[PDB]
UniProtKB/Swiss-Prot annotation:
Acts as a component of the MCM2-7 complex (MCM complex) which is the replicative helicase essential for 'once per cell cycle' DNA replication initiation and elongation in eukaryotic cells. Core component of CDC45-MCM-GINS (CMG) helicase, the molecular machine that unwinds template DNA during replication, and around which the replisome is built. The gene is MCM4. It comes from the Eukaryota. The chain holds residues 431 to 779 of 863 of the full protein. There is a cross-link at residue 9 (Glycyl lysine isopeptide (Lys-Gly) (interchain with G-Cter in SUMO2)). Residues 28-237 form the MCM domain. Sumoylated; SUMO2 modified in response to stress caused by inhibition of proteasome activity (in vitro). ATP 1 binds at residues 67, 213, 294, 297. The lineage of its organism: Eukaryota, Metazoa, Chordata, Craniata, Vertebrata. This is DNA replication licensing factor MCM4.
Amino acid sequence: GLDEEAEQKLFSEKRVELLKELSRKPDIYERLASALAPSIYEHEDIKKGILLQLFGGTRKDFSHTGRGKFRAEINILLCGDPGTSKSQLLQYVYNLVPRGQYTSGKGSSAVGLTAYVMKDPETRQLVLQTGALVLSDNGICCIDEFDKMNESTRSVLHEVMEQQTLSIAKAGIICQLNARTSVLAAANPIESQWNPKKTTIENIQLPHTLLSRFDLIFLMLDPQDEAYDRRLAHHLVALYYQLLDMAVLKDYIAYAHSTIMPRLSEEASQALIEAYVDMRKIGSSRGMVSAYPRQLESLIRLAEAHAKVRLSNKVEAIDVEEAKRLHREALKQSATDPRTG
DNA sequence: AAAAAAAAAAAAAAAAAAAAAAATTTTTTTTTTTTTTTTTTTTTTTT
């Protein structure tokens, strides 16, 4: 938790040195990703995105700039029919992270996600009560069935995912709560399956603004691969007839949050500028998910997260390259083409 | 056929009128009992 991380005397010197060694290993990113969700098979890119979400970005103070808070959290959307493990991933994140809230389909409303007023049935006084997003203030909100979610409740997430605040202006009291939550959304394709006769944007069926608010989108498409099918079948049967330890995973993440505060190096800055220009060029097509300065900030956040994963404390070219590669492989820019579909 | 907007339903909280509920010993009178007294009457003593 936040309090445990804030407390200084949390790790022994031996444990700190062990964590530093693990960060000094070459494939720590792959190791942590494989550690995540051991019961779900071969979602390497998705688990890397989840790991970067857990590590978060670099919290920055922009009060002097007069610019407004900057979201350091990583928002991830998963897209795929109800045959993939998107819901399982959301459940795993919910059961893993502290301050994890869960929502699904139409089982939520705007007031029930932000705040409301109830007569305290022990003092007979009208007290204000928080919603799921506020309850997961410094944690993660996992929103399954994000497609079957009416606009009235879906529109609240704009403020949460953009400003990390929540300005409730009702009769009694008007106040700006803080919901610095990380969104892990899961949405189904139109007609509950990814038909290969439609382009990605229409298959997703989400507003451009809502999709831009996400810094990662993973299209969990289904490749008709006999090898993949056989490996998954063996995985599941072995699961029925049944590593990197969770303890050291916790210690690594807590240490990274406590100490590592990655900053931008010159090479990383130039790489990010070039990457954003190239991303705009590639995404200026018709059916592709376009790119914006929001995507530039998404790359910045992912680079900071990778720096945290490496305990670098300095964002650099390798981090930027990993951010770009992840942001492309997720959303499968390669498999697409100017003639989107 | 689905999404967005409108309207309705259900439910909870607050206010006003009207019926209900709670609190509430002291003071004066007066009757009976006892005692006191004035007169009548009866008894005893004396011549």
